[PDB]
Amino acid sequence: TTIVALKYPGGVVMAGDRRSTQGNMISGRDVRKVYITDDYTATGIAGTAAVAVEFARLYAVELEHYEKLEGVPLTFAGKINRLAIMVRGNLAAAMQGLLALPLLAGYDIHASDPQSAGRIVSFDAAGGWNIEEEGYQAVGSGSLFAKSSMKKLYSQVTDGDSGLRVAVEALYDAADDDSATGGPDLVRGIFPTAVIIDADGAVDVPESRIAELARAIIESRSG
Amino acid sequence: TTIVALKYPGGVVMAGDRRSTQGNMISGRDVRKVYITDDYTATGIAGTAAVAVEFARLYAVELEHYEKLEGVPLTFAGKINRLAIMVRGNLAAAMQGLLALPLLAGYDIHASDPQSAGRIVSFDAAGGWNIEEEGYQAVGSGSLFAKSSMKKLYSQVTDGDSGLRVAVEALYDAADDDSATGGPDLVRGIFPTAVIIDADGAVDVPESRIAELARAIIESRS
Amino acid sequence: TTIVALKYPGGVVMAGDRRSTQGNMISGRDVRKVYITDDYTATGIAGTAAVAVEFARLYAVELEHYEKLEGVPLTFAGKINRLAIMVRGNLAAAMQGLLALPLLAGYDIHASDPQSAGRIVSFDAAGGWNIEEEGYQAVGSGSLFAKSSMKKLYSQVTDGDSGLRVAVEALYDAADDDSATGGPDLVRGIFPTAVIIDADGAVDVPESRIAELARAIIESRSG
Amino acid sequence: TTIVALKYPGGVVMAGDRRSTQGNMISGRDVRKVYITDDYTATGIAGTAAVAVEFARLYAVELEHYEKLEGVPLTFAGKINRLAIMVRGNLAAAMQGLLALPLLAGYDIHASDPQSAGRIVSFDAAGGWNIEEEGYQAVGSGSLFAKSSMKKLYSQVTDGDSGLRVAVEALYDAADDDSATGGPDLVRGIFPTAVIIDADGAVDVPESRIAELARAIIESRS
Amino acid sequence: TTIVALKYPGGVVMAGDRRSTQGNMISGRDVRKVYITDDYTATGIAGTAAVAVEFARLYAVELEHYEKLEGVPLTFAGKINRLAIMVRGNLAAAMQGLLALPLLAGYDIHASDPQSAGRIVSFDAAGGWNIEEEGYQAVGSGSLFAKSSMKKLYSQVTDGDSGLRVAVEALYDAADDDSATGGPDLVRGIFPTAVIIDADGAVDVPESRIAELARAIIESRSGADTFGSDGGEK
Amino acid sequence: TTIVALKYPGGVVMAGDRRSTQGNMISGRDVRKVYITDDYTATGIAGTAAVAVEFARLYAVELEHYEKLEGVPLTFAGKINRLAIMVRGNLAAAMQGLLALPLLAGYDIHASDPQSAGRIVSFDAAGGWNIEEEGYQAVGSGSLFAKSSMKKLYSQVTDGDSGLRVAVEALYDAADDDSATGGPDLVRGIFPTAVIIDADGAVDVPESRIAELARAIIESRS
Amino acid sequence: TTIVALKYPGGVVMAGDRRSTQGNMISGRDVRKVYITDDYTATGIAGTAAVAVEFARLYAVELEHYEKLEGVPLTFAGKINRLAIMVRGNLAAAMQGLLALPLLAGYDIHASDPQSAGRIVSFDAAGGWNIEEEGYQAVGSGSLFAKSSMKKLYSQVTDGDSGLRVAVEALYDAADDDSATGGPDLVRGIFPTAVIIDADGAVDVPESRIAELARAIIESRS
Amino acid sequence: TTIVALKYPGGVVMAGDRRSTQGNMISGRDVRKVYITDDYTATGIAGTAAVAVEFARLYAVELEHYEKLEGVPLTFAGKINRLAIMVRGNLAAAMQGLLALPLLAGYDIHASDPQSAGRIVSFDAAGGWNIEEEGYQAVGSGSLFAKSSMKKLYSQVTDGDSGLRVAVEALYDAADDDSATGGPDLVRGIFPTAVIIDADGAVDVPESRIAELARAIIESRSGADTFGSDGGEK
Amino acid sequence: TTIVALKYPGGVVMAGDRRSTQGNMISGRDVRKVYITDDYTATGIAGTAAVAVEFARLYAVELEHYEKLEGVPLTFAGKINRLAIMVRGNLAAAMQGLLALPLLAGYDIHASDPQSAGRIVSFDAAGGWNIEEEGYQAVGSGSLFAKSSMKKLYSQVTDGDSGLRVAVEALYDAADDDSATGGPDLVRGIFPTAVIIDADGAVDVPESRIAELARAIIESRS
C-alpha cells in the first residue's frame, strides 16, 4: 500500500493505489484507500485493510456526530486530536498485527491566507502527529520511494493539475520499486484513486483524467 | 520466481521469469533462471538466487567433468541421481533458509520413440525425484497458478511454437496471481527466457519471439 | 473443504463439497456447507465444521430477528457488516484453532439493473470484506485450484445452467488437486450441493441435475 | 501410503497404492512403492518417499553385492537382519521427520514344507522385527483399516488369484477410510501395483488383471 | 473404552465394554458406560470415567427438567443441540485432560416411517454433531477396529437380534485389537452391557442373552482358528 | 534530542533542538520541544515525541485548572510535585518503551532575592526530582556533551544575552557529538528554539537572534 | 554509511561518505570507504568498519597474489567470483553482527565496445552477485535514498564530470535523509571521497573538485 | 578507568588514572595503566585489569621479539596491525566480560615533518583502528567527559608542559564526573601517571611535576567555585 | 549512600552522606538524606532517592496526622510499627528495583532513665524491626565499613561532640572504602549533614561545625 499527499497553491491532493496482498499472493485489485471524511478533509490509511476501513468509518462517524450535536464543525486541530487519540488507542492491537497508520489532508477554511490553507498531517504508531511544512508526505510500504520521487518532482507543482500529475508519478515510482504497491493496470483499466480539496470542497477525481495522466507517464518512460 | 516446463511432440520446452525480490522490495529485473547444462538437458532452479546459481554451475561442472573423464556422457538416470544427491546434501542449509528446488527437463537420445523422448523431472526438499507423466510441471512461489493454467491449456500443444505459447501464458498467469513473479515488462522490454530442446540439441529462444507471444497474449486478454 | 460462487446474467450460484476430515482420516461424507440464510442470500463457511454450523445458524437467526423486529429486511450492506462483525469477534477463537471463513452471495432486489444484481462478498480473518468484481470467488483449502479453474472457465458462463456446470467443474478440479476436498462419489451417489439465487429467490438445486452434470464432466475427462 | 502383504497356499503377494501427498495437496499419482529386491523377496516401504526409494535401492545393492562376493545368496534370516540394521541406523534421521517403515515378504526356498514357504516380516521404528504368523500384515497411514479388512476377508484366500483379490480389496478399504491412500483411478486408468512370489520366483502382476479386480470390487460395492 | 451403536429395521441398539484403566493397570472390571437418558434415547460416553458419569447424569437431569417444566418432551434435534452445547462447554476441561466424547442413539416417535425412525448422532471435541446415516458408529480408543468390523458385518443385520450379535462381535474385535478395551470375561462372568430402543421404548438387554451371544462368538472364533492356518501352517 | 537550561543573573533560559528521528531515518526537522506552561515556568521534555507533547499539554492544563479553581497560582514546589507525580505514574508505560524525561525551569516571584529567583529542576525515570544548585542542566541523548560544554562555558554568563549564547553553543556541541541531535540548518534556515524567563515573565526568543548567534558560533569554529 | 556508483560513457565512478558511528554517537569524521583494489577496479564496502577494511585488504592481496603468480591479471568474472566467495564465507560471522556488503565497480579492458566497458556489480548477504544493467547502484544504510535520487538525476550524466556531480548529489541526498550518513562538512572541510576509472586506469579524485561540486550543490539547494 | 592522549608540537603525551574497582568497592589505589612498550610507543588499556596487563606484556614481548629477530623495528603500521589482530582475537573472551580496549600513542621517526610525527590510534571492540586527526583521544568509563574537556582545552596546547597540564585537567574532569575514575589523592599523595614521547624517545614524567600541576588545578577550581555563584546565589 | 547513627549519654546523633549516583555516573552532590520527622525522632532512608524522599514525606505526614487527630503524639513503639508497616507494604516495589531501607533514631520522653533514652531502630527488607542495643547502626552500600569503623571508635564517645566526630569519621571511612558514598568535598565546600536529638528536641547541626570536624580528620590522616 502507498498513499501520497501534496500541497499546491489553493488546495491539496491525496492519492492512493489499489492493491491489497496477503503475503506474496494478490488478493485485491480495486481496493479504495482514500476517503472523504467531510467537506474539507480527506483521510488515507495504510496497513491492515480491515482496520483501515473501520478507522475511516469510525472517524467520519465521530466527526459528523460532533457536527450534528454542536451545530458547528470541529476545528482542524480538534480533528487532528481525535485521529491521534484513535491511533493511540489502537496501539495494543497494532502490536498484535493490526497496525493502521493514517494520513490526513485538509483545507483550513478559517486560515487567514486562502492560498496557504492546505494542510498535511502525519501520524506515527504512538499517536504523535506532525503538521508537514515541506508540502508533501507519504505513508505505506512504498512511502520512502514516493517521498524521494516527490522531493525531486515538487518543483513542477504550480496548480491542481500539475500536483495531480506529480502525485500519480510518485505512486508510479512507488509501485515500480515496491511489489506490495500496484501500478496502473492497463489490461484491466484500473487506476489509482485521487481526491482534490480546494475552497469549494473535496471532490473525487474522475477516472478518465487519472488514466490520461498514467498513460502519459508510461509513454514518457517507455521512450 | 516461477519456472515452467512442458512436453510437446518431438521435444521439451522450459521457461522462467526474470524477477528477484528481497521481501517486498524488487531488487532484480533481468535475472536468468534457466540454464543449459549440456547439449540435451536444461535446469531451472527456484528459491534463493545465490544457491540456484551455485547449484547450476556445480551441476554443469560435474556433468562435463564426468563426460571428459569417461569419454561418454552420463545416462539420464545418472544425471537425475547426481542432481538428487546435490539436493539431498543441501538439506541442512535449506533448513536455515537457503532452500533451492530445481526442475530438470531433457531429451533422451537413447529413448526408443523419438516423439516421446522428452523428459521432465521434479524434485522435493528431501532429495526425492519423480518423472512427470502428465507432460507439464512447475516450480517456484507461483507454481500452483502456472500448473493450474497449464492443466487447462495443455490441450492446445501440438508443436514447439504452441508449447512455447502455452508456457509463456502460464508464466503470465503465475505473475498475474503472484507478486513475487514478474510479468512481461513492456516499458523496459524485459521478457521471460525460454529454452527449447529437441533432437538437434538445446537452443535459447530469441527475445523477439517471446516478445511477440507476450504481446499477443496481452492483446488477447485486454 | 471448498466452496465456490460465481455470477451469471440474472443471478448467482454457490456450490460446496461434502467431505470433512480429521487429519488424514475421513470422518464425514455428506456434510452440507451451503446454507440459505434468507430468501435472497446464501452463505458458505469453510474451516472448522462446528464453528461453520454455529455461524450459519446464528447469522440466520440474527437476520430474521431484525426483519421481524423492524418489519423490513436489512439492506445487503447491513448483512455484510453484521457478518464482518461476527468474523471480527471470532478472531480470538480463530487464533486458537477454531477458524471460520465465510463466503456470502446474494441477489440485490434494490439494485438498479436486474441483470447485474448478483453480489459476491469475501471475508478475511480480520473481518475485512470485499465485494468481488471479477465475477467469481472461492474459499477453503482447495480454493486456489477452483479459482484458477474458474478463471479459465468463466468465459463460458451465459445463463444459470452454464454457471452451475462451471461451478461443478471447479469443485471437481479442486477435489482433484486437494485431498481434503471430496469429489463426486459415484459408488455412494453423493454429489456436491448447490444453491441458485435469482429474482424469484433462492432455491436448492436438485441432486439429479448435479449428478448428471458431474457424470458429463467425468465422461468428458475420461476420453 | 498403504502397503499390504498376505500369505496364500504356495506363495505370497504384496500390493501397494500409488498416491503421494505433501500435506493435503496431492503431488503424485503413479508412485510405485513395491520393489523386487531379488528373485524371491519383495520389499515395500512406507513413510517418506525419498527415504523409501533410497532404502530399497541400497538394500537391493547390498544383497546383490553379498551374493556376488560369496557366490551364494543370503539366508532369509540374514536378509531380515540386514534390513533391521538399516532401520535401526536410520533412527536418528527418522526422529527428524525422515521415517521409513519397510515391509518384507519373501519365499523361503530352504523351508521344509513348500506350501508354507511364504514369509511376512514387519518392522518397527526401533529396528525390531517379527515374523507374522496370522498370514497378513500392512504398513502405512491406512494400515489399520487394511488389516481390519483382511481380518474379515482372509478366510476366502485359497490360491494366488483369491489372495490378489483380497489384497486389492484391502487396499480399496484403506483408501476409502484414509485420504492419504489413493484408490483406483478409473478416469486416469491408474491402479495399485502388486507382486506375486512363489516357487518360480517373484514376478510383477500385469495391470490388466488388477484393473479387472478393481472394477469387479467397485461393481460389487455399487 | 469402546461403545458401538448400529441401526436395524425398527429400532437401534447400543453396547459398550466394561473396563476402566489407569495407564496400564486395570482399575475396573464392571464399569457401565451405556445410560438410558429417557424413554427413547440412550447415551454412551467415552474418555475419562468421572466426566462421563457426570455428563450422563447432568444430561438426564436437564432433559427431565425441561419435560417437567414444559409438559412436553424435547424434539430429537433439541436434545442433540443441548448435548452439543454441553460438549462445547467442556472444551477447556478437555484441553486439560478431562475429555469426554458422547454417542447418542435414539428412536424418533415423530418420524414419518416407523421402520427408519432410529437415529445415531456422533460428536467431536469442538461440539460439532453429525447425524450418522450409514447405519453404525463407534467411539472410544478401540472405535476404529469396531467400526471396520461393523463395516464388514452390517450386511447381516435384519432385526434386533442380529444387530445385537453384530454389536457384540464388534466389541469383541475392538477388545481383541485394543488393550484398553475389555473383552468378554468368562472366568468372572462379566459381559458388555447393551440397550435396545424400539417403538416401545428403551429397555436394558438381559445379561443371559449377551452371555450366550459372546459364548457363540468365542466358539466360532476358536473353530475358525482351528480351521484356518498361516497359508497352510498352524 | 537535547534540551539545555542555565541560570543567569535575573532569570533563566532554556533551549532545545529541532530534530526527531525514527531509528536512523530523519522524520522531523522543525519539532518544538520547549513549552511555556504558564507566565513564569517553561518545560522541556525529552524522549518519545508523542509522550512529550501529551505531557506538556496535560501539565499546562492541570496548572491552569488549579489556578482557575483556587484563584491563586500554585507554588513552585507544588508544580514540581505535580510533575514528579506525572513522571512516577508514567513509569509502567516508560518501561514498555514510552519513556519521557522532562526538564523544568522557572522564575520564583515569591523568592527573597530577585537576582537568585531562577530555578532549574531535573527529574529521573523513577519520579525523583532535584533542584540544581550548579547553574545548568541538560536532558536527552546528547545531554552529557551539552553539560560538559556548559561546565567550561558557564564562567562567561553575565546576563541574558551571554546565557543565551552559551546555551546555543552547548546545543551546537551536543549536535556535533550526537547524530540524534540536529544542528543549525543553514540551508533550510532552521534554528533551535529558546525561551527566556525573567521578572516580566516568560517570552519566546525571536528566531533572528538565535540565527545570528548560531552563525557567529559557526564562524568562530570555522 | 552510503557508497554510490554509476556508469558514464567511457568509464565508471564510485563515491562514499566519511562518517562512522557507534549507535547515535559519532566516532569518525574522515573515514575512507572506497578502495582502489587494482588498476581497473574499485571496491566500496558497507557495514562494520573493521570487517570492511579487512575485506578490502584481503581482496587486494588475493588479486595481486594471483597476478604475480600467473603473470596475468584475473578476468573480471574471476574477480567477481572471488569477492562472492569471500562474502559467502563471511555469512556465519555476519549472522553475529559482523556484516559487510561490498560494491564493485570496474572497467573491462577486454570488452568489445570501449564506451560500454564500465561494470557495476552488487552483492547480497548470501554471496549472490548481479551485474547491474541500469547504470547505477548503491549500498549502505542510506542506499535507498541515494538510489532514488540517482534514478531521477541519471539523465544528466554525459561524461565523467557530470557523473561525479550526480554521485555527489546522491550522497548529499542520502545524508539529508539518513543520520548515519555524513554530509559535506564545510566547517571542518571534510568532503566525500571519489574514484574515477577509465581506459587510463583508476585514480583518486582531488579534494578540491569535490569541494567545489558540494558547494555548488549546497548553494543550489539554499 | 580513564586514559587520555593528546598531541603537541614535537611529541605526544599519554596519561591515566590509578583507581580499580569491583562494582562499587574500591580495590586499588595505585594501579599503573600506561606502559612503555618500546622506545617510541606507549600503550594504555582500559577494561579488565588482568586482561590489560596481559595485553601490554604480550604486545611488548611480540614487538621486541620481532625487533631482535629481524634486526630492525617494525613500522608504525605494523605495530597497529599487530595490536588490532590481538584485539580482534580477544573478541570471543570480551563477549564474556573480559573486555580490553587499548589506546596507542607513538612518535613515527620515519615521518617527514618532525613537528607532526606524533601519532594517536584508537581501537574498538571489533579490532578496527583509526588514526585520530583531531589531536586527542580518550578511552575508559570516563572517556566522554575527558574528551569533551579536551575539546575545549586543546587551544592552550603549545608545548609538552601545556599538553601535560591539559591531560591532567582532562583526567581531573573525568574523575569529577565518573566514580570509577580516581582523582588526585592529596591525603595519600597518589597522582595519575603520565608518559611523554618526543624525538629523544619515551620517558616517564616524574611524580612531582604531576603533583604540582594537579595541586594548581585544584586551587584554580576552588578559586573559581569561590568566585562563582548559582546565577546570583552561592 | 551511607547513613550512620550512634548513641551518646543524653541523646542520639544521625548523619548521612550527600552523593547520589546512576551506576558509575555522579548525578548529585548535595543530596540531603536525614530528615527531622518530628520533635524527637529523625529518619534516614537509603536506596532509591525518590522512594526515600516519598517515604520520609509520607511518614512525617502520617505522624503529624495522628498527633493532630488524637491530640497526643504516638508512642515510640507505635512509630516503629507504622514505619515497619510501610516498609513491609513496599515489598512488591522493592523486589522490582525500588528498595528503600530506613533507619530510625529517636529520644524517648517517657523513658525512665534520661541518660539512656536514646533509641536506634533498624529495618530489613521484610519489614522486621530490631531495637539496636549495641549503641550504633548504619545502612546503605557503605554500611559495613561504617559499622566496622564505629566498632573501634565507639569507646571514644562521651558526649554529643565526640559522638558527632565519631559519626563523621565513620562516614569518612565508608566513603573511603565505597565509591557510591561521597566524601567531604573541600573544593565545593560540601559536607555531610547531621541531626542531634536530646531532651530539648532535634536540631540540625550547622555546616561550620561539621566542616571543622572533617578538616580535623583529614589533617589527622594526612
Numbering used by the authors:
A (entry chain P), C (entry chain J): 301 to 523
B (entry chain M), D (entry chain H), F (entry chain R), G (entry chain S), I (entry chain L): 301 to 522
E (entry chain U), H (entry chain W): 301 to 534
Which statements did the authors publish about this structure?
The initial 2D and 3D image processing scheme visualized a class with Mpa-bound proteasome in addition to a class containing uncapped 20S CP. The structure of Mpa bound to the 20S CP that was determined without applying any symmetry, revealed a 6-edged, star-shaped density originating from a hexameric Mpa bound to the heptameric α-ring of the 20S CP. The structure of the 20S CP particle was determined by focused refinement using a binary mask for this region and was resolved at 2.8 Å resolution. Our structure of the substrate-engaged proteasome resolves the interaction between Mpa and the gate of the 20S CP. It demonstrates that the C-terminal extensions of Mpa containing the terminal GQYL motifs are able to adopt a conformation facing outside of the Mpa pore, and that their GQYL motifs occupy the binding pockets between the proteasome α-ring subunits upon complex formation. Although the α-ring subunits lack the N-terminal seven residues in the open-gate 20S CP, we still observed a slight increase in proteasomal gate diameter on the Mpa-bound side compared to the Mpa-free side, which is indicative of the conformational change undergone by the proteasomal α-rings upon insertion of the GQYL motifs into the α-ring binding pockets. Densities for the GQYL motif were resolved in all seven pockets due to averaging resulting from the inherent D7 symmetry of the 20S CP. We tentatively assigned six GQYL motifs based on their proximity to the respective Mpa protomers. The last GQYL motif was not assigned to any of the Mpa protomers and was included as a separate chain in the model.
